[PDB]
Design a protein around this ligand. Structure first.
Ligand SMILES: *[C@@](C)(CO)[C@](*)(O)[C@H](CC(C)C)NC(=O)[C@H](Cc1ccccc1)NC(=O)[C@H](CC(C)C)NC(=O)[C@H](CCc1ccccc1)NC(=O)CN1CCOCC1
Ligand SMILES: [Mg+2]
Lengths: 222, 244, 195, 231, 240, 233, 212, 235
C-alpha cells in the first residue's frame, strides 16, 4: 500500500538571546541508510525578520515553508505593507498546520526572530499546530539528545549555587551571541557523534534588528 | 437577454395587490360554482359541472369533487389540471403525516400546507400561480366537522357555509339567508341544491350537470363515512327535494 | 448511562433512571438526570453512547415543543413515540447512527390512560406494562413478571420499583449511584425527591 | 440608443455601447502617466480628493516585486483586476519558480476583461490600467483598456486631459527612452509629462504619486514627503 | 433558479417594491399594540364583511411564537404565516443552543432580518407584512413591544398601531398615552387598546380581538363577552 | 493507490565544470521479466534540459506528454520562446515537483523518481531530484534506485563537494558515469547492458548519445571459482 | 495532564499542571493549560494539545462575537455548549479533548461545565480531567468541604495537582492557579513542582514515601 | 426594464447612483477625527413621539478599536456590520492582533459591488467607519455602496450633508481636542436637524486608544449639549 510519508532525518535548534535569536539546522538530507544530499538547507529567511525551519518529512516541510512565505507576501498586500510580527506569524502557522489536522504535515516547525519589544523570540510547533514561545528548543531526529543539554546550559536546570546546600538556584541570564553559537556548535557535534542521520554540515541563521546573518560550519561526514 | 420576456409574476401593483393572484381569481370566477355547507352531524359538498355535453360520460367522471383521504375531501373551482397537481401533493402529505405519527392528519394542518404551497408561487420562483380555489370538507377528533377554503393567494379561512367559483356574491347571500347553526345534513343537502338552482347560469338544474358528496358520521358507531354520490343517487336526491 | 426502567400502572407511568455518569475508572457525576420533558404529559428517558444520548433527546424535545407552539396542541404519547421511532429508524441507516435507547412514558389526556413505549437505537418500538434497557432487563423483567399487577396504584408501583433497584444494587457489577424517579399522570410530570 | 441596454448587444454599425460607456468612465478619471527607458519603468499618477477634508484616492497598486500598475476610472474594478494579476504572478512563482512576463500579464488581463463583454448578466470593467514591470526582456509599459485591448508602449497616459501628457511624451520620446541607469531623471521626465495635463491645479506633496521598477530596483511606490524632491 | 432582481432602486432613490409592500400593509386590517406598566396588550381588527365564518378554526390574528412572546400583523395573511413559522423555529433553536428562551428584541431582530433579506435577494418579492412583536424577556418583568416592516427596519414602541386607518388610531394614542404614567393595570391597558380600535372599527361585536400577555409566559386571549364589556363601558362614558 | 507494473531502473547523474551529465539504461522491466529493451528514459526539453525518469513507465509516458505540452504552451504568444523566455531547467523541475507532490497529496502518485539535469541561461549547472512523495533535493551527484547505493559512492570520489566541480572535466566526469553504469550491470538484476547518456554543456550545448553499451568487463576470474567451499573440481 | 476545578463558598478554584508529553518523551514543562476567554470565563485543556489549544481560542472568538451581537457577556452554559456542539460535529474523527469551562455570570453564579471530545457535557461542582485525574481526585475529595476559605481552597487545588504531578508520570512541570469570583478571574501564580514539592514536604510533613 | 449592472452613457452604474439618492434621504451622521480620538454623532430622527428613541441604533461597535455610524436605508447595514465584526474577530484569531481600520473598511467595501444578476441590488446605506490602530493612528472612513472609501479628517453624510460638510470645512483644524470635536458635532447636528436637538433625538460616540469604542449615555450628551449652548451665548 502507498505510504504518503517519509523520514528525511536531520535536526534543528533554536535559541533566543536578549536582542537576538538563532535558528540552526544540519544540512544533511537522508532516506533510510542513504545520504541524499550533504548540503540541502532547511532553515529559511521568510522576510520581516522571521527565520523558519520545518524538519521531518522534507516534502511537507518545503510545502509549509512555501505556504508561510506566501502568507507573508499576502499579509503585505492586504494590510498596507505592515510588518508581520513573530507572534502573528506563529498564530498564522498554527492555522496552516491545523488546516491539515486530518492529513498532517509530518514536521516539527520552529521559527525565530524578534518580538515587538525587540527581544529574541523562538516559537516551536507540533505537527498539527500546537505552539509555544520558549527561550530554547531542539527539533527533529536528535532532539532527544540535544534538548536536555539545552535545559542544562541555556536555562541552567539542575544547577545550584556552590556551597548553598542546593537551596539557591543558578540565576537565569541572557547569553551573548558568541556563547549561544558555542552551544549550538557543541550540540551539533555531539549529535553528529551519536546520531547517524545528523552530520555533513551546520548552517546557523542569526537574527538581529540589523537583519538576518548566516554562518556555516563543517560536520563529520560519516 | 431573457429579461425582455419576463412577465414578473410575483410583484406588487402600485396599490399593493398581486397582479397574477387577482387575475387568477378573475379566472376562477368563471368556473362552475361549488358550495360547501357544514352541519352539526355532517358536511355537504355540492358543485356544478361546466356546461355539460350530452355525450359526456357522466358516471365515470371526476371534475369537481376529489378525495384526499378517508376523512377529507375537496371541491375544486378553476383549472382542473392545476387542481390535480395540488391534490396529489395533498394526498402525499396526508400519508407522510400518518406514516410519521400513526394518526390521520388534522384537517387544518393539511389545508395550511397546501395553502403554503400556493403562497410560495406568489412570492418566489417567477412562475404563474395555481388558478384554483378549494373548498376543504373534512373531519378529525379535535375540531370535528370543518369547512375551509383556499385561493391562489395561499390565504385560507374557515366557514360554516361557503361558495367558490361563479356567482359567489349571489350564492353567499342566499346561504347567509337560510343557514342556521342547528342544521342537519339532510337540510344542508336541500340548501346546497336550492342555492345552485337559483344561482346557476343554466336554464334548469339537472342530475347530469352536478357533482355531490357528503361526509357524515352515518356509519356504524363513532366513525366517518365519505359518500361520493352516483348519477342515479343525485337524480333521486334532486327529485326528493322537488327541483325536478 | 446504563440503567433506565419504566413501569406503567393503573393511572400513571413511572420512570427510574440511574444517576451515575462514568468515564474510564472515574465516576464523574452522581446526580445526572437522564431524561427530558417532551411535553407537559410526555417524558423520555435515555441511555447509550456518550454525547449521542443528550444530543438526540434535546433534538426530539425541540421538535415536539415546536409542534406544540404551531398547533397550540399537545401530541399524544403514541404520536410522539411514532415520531421518535421514525427518527431512530432513519438514524440507523445514516453515516453515523444515534446509539441511543429510550423509554417514553406519557399520559394520554384524550383516552385518560398511561402509556409506556420502549424504543431501541434500531427504531424498534413496543408498548409495554413495564420496560427496561441494557443489562437491567435481565433482572427486572423476571422480577416484574412475578410481582407486577395491571391495577396497581402509583404507590404500589413505587414499591415495585424499589424492589427492582434493590435487586440491581445487589447483583449488578457497576455502582450506578441510585436512581432519579419521575411520575407521569393526568396532572403532568413530577419528580420523587426522596428515593 | 436601443442597443446599449447590455453588453451582449451589437449596434447596427457594429459597436458595443456598454463597452464604450465603460471607456467613458476612464475619461472622467484622474490623469495618470506611464513611461520607460531601457533600464527602468515609471508610473506617475495625479491623485484626486473628494474635498480638502478627505484623503487623496490611491492610484497605484503593487502586483509583484517586479510588476505593478496605476488606475483610472472605477477603483473597485482596478482592485479586482490587480488582485487577479497578483494571483497570476504568484501562480507563476510557486508552480514554475518563474517571474511572470509583463506581456503574459497583459494577455491575461485582456482575456479576463473580454469574457465580461460577451456574456449576458455581467458588465465590462470600468477602469483603465497602466502596467509597468521589469522581467527577463527588460523594462516594459502596458496600457489596458476594459474593451480588452492591451497595448505595449514606450510611454502613454490615460484619464482626463491625458492628451496633453501623451503629446509631450510623443515629442520627448527620443530623450526619455535613453535615460538609462538614472531613476530620478526618468521620474522628472514623467513629472514634467503629467504637468501638461494640469489645469488651475498644480502638483503638491500629498497630490503627486510616483512608482518605479527597474534592473536593480523592486517595484516601489513613493507618496507624501518622498515625492517633494520632484516638485 | 429564478434570479430576477425585483426589488431595485429608482431614479429618485426609492425601492418601489418595498414601498408597494407597505401599501399592502395599509390595506390590511388594523392591528394595535399598547404596553402598560406590567403587561402588553395586542388589539386586532377583524372586518365584518365576512359573516358565516367559523371563529373556532379560522386562523387567529395574534400568534404565539414561544410561550412568552406573541406576534400580530397587518397585511398579506399568507405572507405572515411564513414569518411566524421561521420565528417559531428560531425560538426553539435558540433554546437548544443558548439554553435560554429568546429575548423579544432578539426575536424581532431575527424576523426583521428575514424581511430585509427579501428586499435584496434575487427572485423574491418583499413580505407585504408589518408585525407587532410583544412579550417579556426570560426572568424579566419589563414589558417589550416592537414593530417591524417590509424594508426590514425595526424599533421599540410604548404604543403603536399598523394597518388600515392606523394614522387615525396613532393620532388617538399619541394624545391619550402618557410616557410618564403608562396604564398601571391590565384593565387600564386593555381599555385604552379597545378605545383606540373603536375610533376605527365600526361595531365592538365580533370585530375586535384582544390578547393580553403578562410576565413568565402568562398569555391569554379574551372572549367575545369579555371584550364586549369594555365596549359597553366605553360607550356609556362617551355619552357625556 | 497504485502499484508499478512496467518499470525502469537507476538514473544516474553528476555535475562537472561546464555542465551536467545524466545517464539511464534502455530497459523496461515487467517484474523479473526483462520485457522491453528499446525504452528511452532520458527525455530532452528544449536544448538545455534533460529529464531522466525511473519507476513506472506508463507514468513516465504521461510525464513525457506533459513536458511536450509545456513546450507548446510556452511558445503561445511568446516572441522570445527561443530566446529570453525559453524554458529553463528550474522552471521544468518546479512544474514537475508541483505535480508530483499534488499527486501524492491526492493519494494517487506518479510512481517515479525523477532527475532534472540542465544548464540555466546564466550558465549555472542545474541538477535536482524529485520522486513520487514530492521529496526534492540537490547534490553534485544524484542517482535513483540502485544507482543511489552503488553509483553515488563512485561519483562522489570524483566530486565529493561543491569545490570539486570546477576541477572536474567532462572527460573525467563521463568516464565515471560510464564506469558506474558497468557496476550497475554487474550488480543490479533489473538492469541492461544498453543505455543512453546525455551531456548538457554551457558552451557546446546538448549532446544526446544513444545505443551505448557497457564494455571492458571483468569476467575471466569466474573460471577459477569452483564449488561453494570444499569442492576442488 | 492533570487539571481540576471545584466550586466552593468563595467561588471557583481552577488548577492545572504544565507538562506536555509525546509518548514517554517530556516535550515541555511550561505549557499554558488555562485559556483566558474573557475576564469572567476560563477554559482548561487536557488531551490533544493542538485540538484543545486551537478550538478553545476559537471558542473565545465565538464568545466575543456573542457580546458584540447581543451587547451582553455570554453565559457559561452557552459558551460550553458552543464547544460541545462543535466537537460533536467532529465525533468519530479522532479529536482528543477533555475540557472544563469555568466562569461567573449574574444569572448563573459561579458555574463549571465539563466538556469532552466524545460529546459529553456536564454541569457540576467538582471535576478532575486528564491522565492524572484520579490522583487529584484522591487528595481533593478527601479534603474538600464547601466551607473552605479562599486561602485553603487555593492550597487544596495546588496540593491536588502536586499529588498527581508526583504519582502520574505524564503530569508535572508546574502548577498554575486561578480563582474565579463575582468580579472575574484572578491569577494566583506559577508554582514549579521542583521547589514546591520539597517546600510542601517539609512544611506539611507529607510525602513520607520519598527519601527526604 | 433594464439590467441591474448597467452603465449609463456618462459612465456610471445606474443602481449605484440611485442608491446614493436613497442615502441623501437618510438621517444625518457626522464624524470628526482628532489626535486625541475620533468622534461619531448621528441624528436619530424618530418618526413618531411614541417610538422609544433609545432603541434607534444608528451607531454601532465593530470591535473594541473600531466603531461605525450609518445613514440611509439602515436595515441594509445589518449584514455589513455582521461582516465587519466577523472580519475583525477572524483576523484576531488568525494573527493574534487587532486589525487595521483601513483593512476592515476594505473588507466591508468588497461586499458593495457584489450585486447583479450575489445580492440583487447595491446597499442603500453609507457608513462612517471610525477607529484606531498602532500604524496609522486615529482614522475616519466613509464607505459608500460604490465600493469606494475615502479617509476623512471630518465627514458628514445624510440629508444635511452638503450644508454640514461646508461647515466642517471651516471649523476643522489639526489641533482639535476631543472635547472641542464633541461640541462641534453637536453644533453642526443642531444646525441641519429639522427638530430641535436634545439628548433623546441625537447620539454621540467616540473611539480612543485607551478606553476603546464607547457610545455616550444620554446623561453625558445632555451635559455636552448644555455646555455647547452656554459657549455660543458667551460671545
Ligand atoms: C497530559 C500531559 C497527558 O497528555 C495532558 O493531557 C497534555 C495536555 C496539554 C498539552 C494540552 N497532553 C499532551 O501533552 C498531549 C498528549 C497527547 C499526545 C498525542 C495525542 C493525544 C494526546 N500531547 C500532545 O498533543 C503532544 C504535544 C506536543 C508534544 C507539543 N503532541 C503530539 O504528540 C504530536 C501531535 C499528535 C497528533 C495528534 C493528532 C494528529 C496528529 C498528531 N505528535 C508528535 O509530536 C509526534 N512526534 C513527536 C516526537 O517526534 C516524532 C513526532
Ligand atoms: Mg553522524
Amino acid at each position: 500500500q502507498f505510504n504518503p510519508y517519509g523520514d528525511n532525518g536531520g535536526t534543528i535548534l533554536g535559541i533566543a538571546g536578549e536582542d537576538f535569536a538563532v535558528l540552526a539546522g544540519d544540512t544533511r538530507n537522508i532516506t533510510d541508510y542513504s545520504i541524499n544530499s550533504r548540503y540541502e538547507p532547511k532553515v529559511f529567511d521568510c522576510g520581516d525578520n522571521i527565520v523558519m525551519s520545518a524538519n521531518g518529512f522534507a516534502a511537507d516541510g518545503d510545502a509549509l515553508v512555501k505556504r508561510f512565505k506566501n502568507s507573508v507576501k499576502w499579509y503585505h498586500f492586504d494590510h498596507n505593507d505592515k510588518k508581520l510580527s513573530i507572534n502573528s506569524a506563529a498564530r498564522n502557522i498554527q492555522h496552516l498546520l491545523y488546516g491539515k489536522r486530518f492529513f498532517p504535515y509530518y514536521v516539527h516547525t520552529i521559527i525565530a526572530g524578534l518580538d515587538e519589544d525587540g527581544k529574541g523570540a523562538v516559537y516551536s510547533f507540533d505537527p498539527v499546530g500546537s505552539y509555544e514561545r520558549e527561550q530554547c528548543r531542539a527539533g527533529g531526529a536528535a532532539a532527544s539528545l540535544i534538548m536536555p543539554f539545552l535545559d542544562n546550559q541555556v536555562n541552567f536546570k539542575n544547577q545550584y549555587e556552590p556551597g548553598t546546600n542546593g537551596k539557591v538556584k543558578k540565576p537565569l541570564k541572557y547569553l551573548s551571541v558568541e556563547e549561544v553559537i558555542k552551544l549550538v556548535r557543541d550540540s551539533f557535534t555531539s549529535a553528529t557523534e551519536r546520531h547517524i542521520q545528523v552530520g555533513d554540515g551546520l548552517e546557523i541563521l542569526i537574527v538581529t534588528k540589523d537583519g538576518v546573518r548566516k554562518e556555516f560550519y563543517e560536520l563529520k561526514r560519516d | 437577454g431573457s429579461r425582455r420576456y419576463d412577465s414578473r409574476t410575483t410583484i406588487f401593483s402600485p396599490e399593493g395587490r398581486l397582479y397574477q393572484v387577482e387575475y387568477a381569481l378573475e379566472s376562477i370566477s368563471h368556473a362552475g360554482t361549488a358550495i360547501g355547507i357544514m352541519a352539526s352531524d355532517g358536511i355537504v359538498l355540492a358543485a356544478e359541472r361546466k356546461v355539460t355535453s350530452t355525450l359526456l360520460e357522466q358516471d365515470t367522471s371526476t371534475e369537481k369533487l376529489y378525495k384526499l383521504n378517508d376523512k377529507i375531501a375537496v371541491a375544486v373551482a378553476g383549472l382542473t389540471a392545476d387542481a390535480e397537481i395540488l391534490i396529489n401533493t395533498a394526498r402525499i402529505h396526508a400519508q407522510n403525516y400518518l406514516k410519521t405519527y400513526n394518526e390521520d392528519i388534522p384537517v387544518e394542518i393539511l389545508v395550511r400546507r397546501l395553502s403554503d404551497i400556493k403562497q410560495g408561487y406568489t412570492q418566489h420562483g417567477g412562475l404563474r400561480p395555481f388558478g384554483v380555489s378549494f373548498i376543504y370538507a373534512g373531519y378529525d377528533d379535535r375540531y370535528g366537522y370543518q369547512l375551509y377554503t383556499s385561493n391562489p393567494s395561499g390565504n385560507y379561512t374557515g366557514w360554516k357555509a361557503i361558495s367558490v367559483g361563479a356567482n359567489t356574491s349571489a350564492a353567499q347571500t342566499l346561504l347567509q339567508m337560510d343557514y342556521k347553526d342547528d342544521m342537519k345534513v339532510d337540510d344542508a343537502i336541500e340548501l346546497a341544491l336550492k342555492t345552485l338552482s337559483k344561482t346557476t347560469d343554466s336554464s334548469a338544474l339537472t342530475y347530469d350537470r352536478l357533482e355531490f358528496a357528503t361526509i357524515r358520521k352515518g356509519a356504524n358507531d363513532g366513525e366517518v363515512y365519505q359518500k361520493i354520490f352516483k348519477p342515479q343517487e343525485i337524480k333521486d336526491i334532486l327529485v326528493k327535494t322537488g327541483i325536478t | 448511562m446504563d440503567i433506565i426502567l419504566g413501569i406503567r400502572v393503573q393511572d400513571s407511568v413511572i420512570l427510574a433512571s440511574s444517576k451515575a455518569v462514568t468515564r474510564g475508572i472515574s465516576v464523574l457525576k452522581d446526580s445526572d438526570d437522564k431524561t427530558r420533558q417532551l411535553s407537559p404529559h410526555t417524558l423520555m428517558s435515555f441511555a447509550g453512547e456518550a454525547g449521542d444520548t443528550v444530543q438526540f433527546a434535546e433534538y426530539i424535545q425541540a421538535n415536539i415543543q415546536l409542534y406544540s407552539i404551531r398547533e397550540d396542541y399537545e401530541l399524544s404519547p403514541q404520536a410522539v413515540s411514532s415520531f421518535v421511532r421514525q427518527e431512530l429508524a432513519k438514524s440507523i441507516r445514516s453515516r453515523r447512527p444515534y446509539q441511543v435507547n429510550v423509554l417514553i412514558g406519557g399520559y394520554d389526556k384524550k383516552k385518560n390512560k398511561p402509556e409506556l413505549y420502549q424504543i431501541d437505537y434500531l427504531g424498534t418500538k413496543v408498548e409495554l406494562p413495564y420496560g427496561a434497557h441494557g443489562y437491567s432487563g435481565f433482572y427486572t423483567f423476571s422480577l416484574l413478571d412475578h410481582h407486577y399487577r395491571p391495577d396497581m396504584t402509583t404507590e404500589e408501583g413505587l414499591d415495585l420499583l424499589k424492589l427492582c433497584v434493590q435487586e440491581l444494587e445487589k447483583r449488578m457489577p457497576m455502582d450506578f449511584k441510585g436512581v432519579i424517579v419521575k411520575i407521569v399522570d393526568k396532572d403532568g410530570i413530577r419528580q420523587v425527591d426522596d428515593f | 440608443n436601443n442597443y446599449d441596454g447590455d453588453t451582449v448587444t451589437f449596434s447596427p454599425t457594429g459597436r458595443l455601447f456598454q463597452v464604450e460607456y465603460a471607456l467613458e468612465a476612464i475619461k472622467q478619471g484622474s490623469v495618470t502617466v506611464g513611461l520607460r527607458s531601457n533600464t527602468h519603468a515609471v508610473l506617475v499618477a495625479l491623485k484626486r480628493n473628494a474635498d480638502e477634508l478627505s484623503s487623496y484616492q490611491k492610484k497605484i497598486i503593487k502586483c509583484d516585486e517586479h510588476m505593478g500598475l496605476s488606475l483610472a476610472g472605477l477603483a473597485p474594478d482596478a482592485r479586482v483586476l490587480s488582485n487577479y494579476l497578483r494571483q497570476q504572478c504568484n501562480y507563476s512563482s510557486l508552480v514554475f519558480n518563474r517571474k511572470l512576463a509583463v506581456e503574459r500579464a497583459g494577455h491575461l488581463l485582456c482575456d479576463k476583461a473580454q469574457k465580461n463583454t460577451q456574456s449576458y448578466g455581467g458588465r465590462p470593467y470600468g477602469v483603465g490600467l497602466l502596467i509597468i514591470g521589469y522581467d527577463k526582456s527588460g523594462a516594459h509599459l502596458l496600457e489596458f483598456q476594459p474593451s480588452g485591448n492591451v497595448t505595449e508602449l514606450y510611454g502613454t497616459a490615460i484619464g482626463a486631459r491625458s492628451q496633453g501628457a501623451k503629446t509631450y511624451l510623443e515629442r520627448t520620446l527620443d530623450t526619455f527612452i535613453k535615460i538609462d541607469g538614472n531613476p530620478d531623471e526618468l521620474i522628472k521626465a514623467g513629472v514634467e509629462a503629467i504637468s501638461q495635463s494640469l489645469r488651475d491645479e498644480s502638483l503638491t506633496v500629498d497630490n503627486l504619486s510616483i512608482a518605479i521598477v527597474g534592473k536593480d530596483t523592486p517595484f516601489t511606490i513613493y507618496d507624501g514627503e518622498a515625492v517633494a524632491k520632484y516638485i | 433558479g429564478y434570479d430576477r432582481a425585483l426589488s431595485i432602486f429608482s431614479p429618485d432613490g426609492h425601492i418601489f417594491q418595498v414601498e408597494y409592500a407597505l401599501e399592502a400593509v395599509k390595506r390590511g386590517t388594523c392591528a394595535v399594540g399598547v404596553k402598560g406598566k406590567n403587561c402588553v396588550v395586542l388589539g386586532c381588527e377583524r372586518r365584518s364583511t365576512l359573516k358565516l365564518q367559523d371563529t373556532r378554526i379560522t386562523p387567529s390574528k395574534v400568534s404565539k411564537i414561544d410561550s412568552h412572546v406573541v406576534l400580530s400583523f397587518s397585511g398579506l395573511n399568507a405572507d405572515s404565516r411564513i414569518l411566524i413559522e421561521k420565528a417559531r423555529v428560531e425560538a426553539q433553536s435558540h433554546r437548544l443552543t443558548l439554553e435560554d428562551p429568546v429575548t423579544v428584541e432578539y426575536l424581532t431582530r431575527y424576523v426583521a432580518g428575514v424581511q430585509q433579506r427579501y428586499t435584496q435577494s434575487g427572485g423574491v418579492r418583499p413580505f407585504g407584512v408589518s408585525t407587532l412583536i410583544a412579550g417579556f424577556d426570560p426572568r424579566d418583568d419589563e414589558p417589550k413591544l416592537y414593530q417591524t416592516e417590509p424594508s426590514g427596519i425595526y424599533s421599540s414602541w410604548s404604543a403603536q398601531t399598523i394597518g388600515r386607518n392606523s394614522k387615525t388610531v396613532r393620532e388617538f394614542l399619541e394624545k391619550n398615552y402618557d410616557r410618564k404614567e403608562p396604564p398601571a393595570t391590565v384593565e387600564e391597558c386593555v381599555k385604552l387598546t379597545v378605545r383606540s380600535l373603536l375610533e376605527v372599527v365600526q361595531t365592538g361585536a365580533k370585530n375586535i380581538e384582544i390578547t393580553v400577555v403578562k410576565p413568565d409566559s402568562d398569555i391569554v386571549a379574551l372572549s367575545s363577552e369579555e371584550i364586549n364589556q369594555y365596549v359597553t363601558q366605553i360607550e356609556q362614558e362617551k355619552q357625556e | 493507490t497504485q502499484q508499478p507494473i512496467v518499470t525502469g531502473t537507476s538514473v544516474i547523474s553528476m555535475k562537472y565544470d561546464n555542465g551536467v551529465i545524466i545517464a539511464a539504461d534502455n530497459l523496461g522491466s515487467y517484474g523479473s521479466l526483462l520485457r522491453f529493451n528499446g525504452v528511452e528514459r532520458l527525455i530532452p526539453v528544449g536544448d538545455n534540459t534533460v529529464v531522466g525518469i525511473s519507476g513506472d513507465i506508463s507514468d513516465m509516458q504521461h510525464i513525457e506528454r506533459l513536458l511536450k505540452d509545456l513546450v507548446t504552451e510556452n511558445a503561445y504568444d511568446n516572441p522570445l520562446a527561443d530566446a529570453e523566455e525559453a524554458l529553463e531547467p528550474s522552471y521544468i523541475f518546479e512544474y514537475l515537483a508541483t505535480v508530483m507532490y499534488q499527486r501524492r497529496s491526492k493519494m494517487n502518485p506518479l510512481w517515479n523518481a525523477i532527475i532534472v539535469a540542465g544548464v540555466q541561461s546564466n550558465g549555472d549547472q542545474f541538477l535536482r531530484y524529485v520522486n513520487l512523495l514530492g521529496v526534492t533535493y540537490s547534490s553534485p551527484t544524484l542517482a535513483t534506485g540502485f544507482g543511489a547505493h552503488m553509483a553515488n559512492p563512485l561519483l562522489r570520489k570524483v566530486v565529493d563537494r561543491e569545490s570539486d566541480i570546477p576541477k572536474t572535466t567532462v572527460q573525467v566526469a563521463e568516464e565515471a558515469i560510464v564506469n558506474a553504469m558497468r557496476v550497475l550491470y554487474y550488480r543490479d538484476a533489473r538492469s541492461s547492458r544498453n543505455f543512453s547518456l546525455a551531456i548538457i554543456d554551457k558552451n557546446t550545448g546538448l549532446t544526446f548519445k544513444k545505443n551505448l553499451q557497457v564494455e571492458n568487463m571483468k569476467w575471466d576470474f569466474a573460471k577459477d571459482i569452483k564449488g561453494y567451499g570444499t569442492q576442488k573440481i | 495532564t492533570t487539571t481540576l476545578a471545584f466550586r466552593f463558598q468563595g467561588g471557583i478554584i481552577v488548577a492545572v499542571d504544565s507538562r506536555a508529553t509525546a509518548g514517554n518523551w517530556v516535550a515541555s514543562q511550561t505549557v499554558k493549560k488555562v485559556i483566558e476567554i474573557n475576564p469572567f470565563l476560563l477554559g482548561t485543556m487536557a488531551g490533544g494539545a493542538a485540538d484543545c489549544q486551537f478550538w478553545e481560542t476559537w471558542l473565545g472568538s465565538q464568545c466575543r462575537l456573542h457580546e458584540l451581537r447581543e451587547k451582553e457577556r455570554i453565559s457559561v452554559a452557552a459558551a460550553s455548549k458552543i464547544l460541545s456542539n462543535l466537537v460533536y460535529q467532529y465525533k468519530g474523527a479522532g479529536l482528543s479533548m477533555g475540557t472544563m469551562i469555568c466562569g461567573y455570570t449574574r444569572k448563573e453564579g459561579p458555574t463549571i461545565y465539563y466538556v469532552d471530545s466524545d460529546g459529553t457535557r456536564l454541569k457540576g461542582d467538582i471535576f478532575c480531567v486528564g491522565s492524572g485525574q484520579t490522583f487529584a481526585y484522591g487528595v481533593l475529595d478527601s479534603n474538600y468541604k464547601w466551607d473552605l476559605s479562599v486561602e485553603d481552597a487555593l492550597y487544596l487545588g495546588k496540593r491536588s495537582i502536586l499529588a498527581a504531578a508526583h504519582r502520574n508520570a505524564y503530569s508535572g512541570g508546574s502548577v498554575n492557579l486561578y480563582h474565579v469570583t463575582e468580579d472575574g478571574w484572578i491569577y494566583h501564580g506559577n508554582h514549579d513542582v521542583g521547589e514546591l514539592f520539597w517546600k510542601v514536604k517539609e512544611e506539611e510533613g507529607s510525602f513520607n514515601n520519598v527519601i527526604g | 426594464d433594464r439590467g441591474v449592472s448597467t452603465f449609463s452613457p456618462e459612465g456610471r452604474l445606474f443602481q449605484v447612483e440611485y442608491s446614493l439618492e436613497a442615502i441623501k434621504l437618510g438621517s444625518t451622521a457626522i464624524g470628526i477625527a482628532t489626535k486625541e480620538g475620533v468622534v461619531l454623532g448621528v441624528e436619530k430622527r424618530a418618526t413618531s413621539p411614541l417610538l422609544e428613541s433609545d432603541s434607534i441604533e444608528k451607531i454601532v461597535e465593530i470591535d473594541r478599536h473600531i466603531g461605525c455610524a450609518m445613514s440611509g436605508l439602515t436595515a441594509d447595514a445589518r449584514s455589513m456590520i455582521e461582516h465587519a465584526r466577523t472580519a475583525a474577530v477572524t483576523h484576531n484569531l488568525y494573527y493574534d492582533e487587532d486589525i487595521n481600520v483601513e483593512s476592515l473598511t476594505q473588507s466591508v467595501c468588497d461586499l458593495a459591488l457584489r450585486f447583479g444578476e450575489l445580492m440583487s441590488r447595491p446597499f442603500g446605506v453609507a457608513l462612517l467607519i471610525a477607529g484606531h490602530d498602532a500604524d496609522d493612528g486615529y482614522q475616519l472612513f466613509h464607505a459608500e455602496p460604490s465600493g469606494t472609501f475615502y479617509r476623512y479628517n471630518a465627514k458628514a453624510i445624510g440629508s444635511g450633508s452638503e450644508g454640514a460638510q461646508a461647515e466642517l470645512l471651516n471649523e476643522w483644524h489639526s489641533s482639535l481636542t476631543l472635547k472641542e470635536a464633541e461640541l462641534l458635532v453637536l453644533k453642526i447636528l443642531k444646525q441641519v436637524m429639522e427638530e430641535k436637538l436634545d439628548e433623546n433625538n441625537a447620539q454621540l460616540s467616540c473611539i480612543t486608544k485607551q478606553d476603546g469604542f464607547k457610545i455616550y449615555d444620554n446623561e453625558k450628551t445632555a451635559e455636552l449639549i448644555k455646555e455647547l449652548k452656554e459657549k455660543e451665548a458667551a460671545e
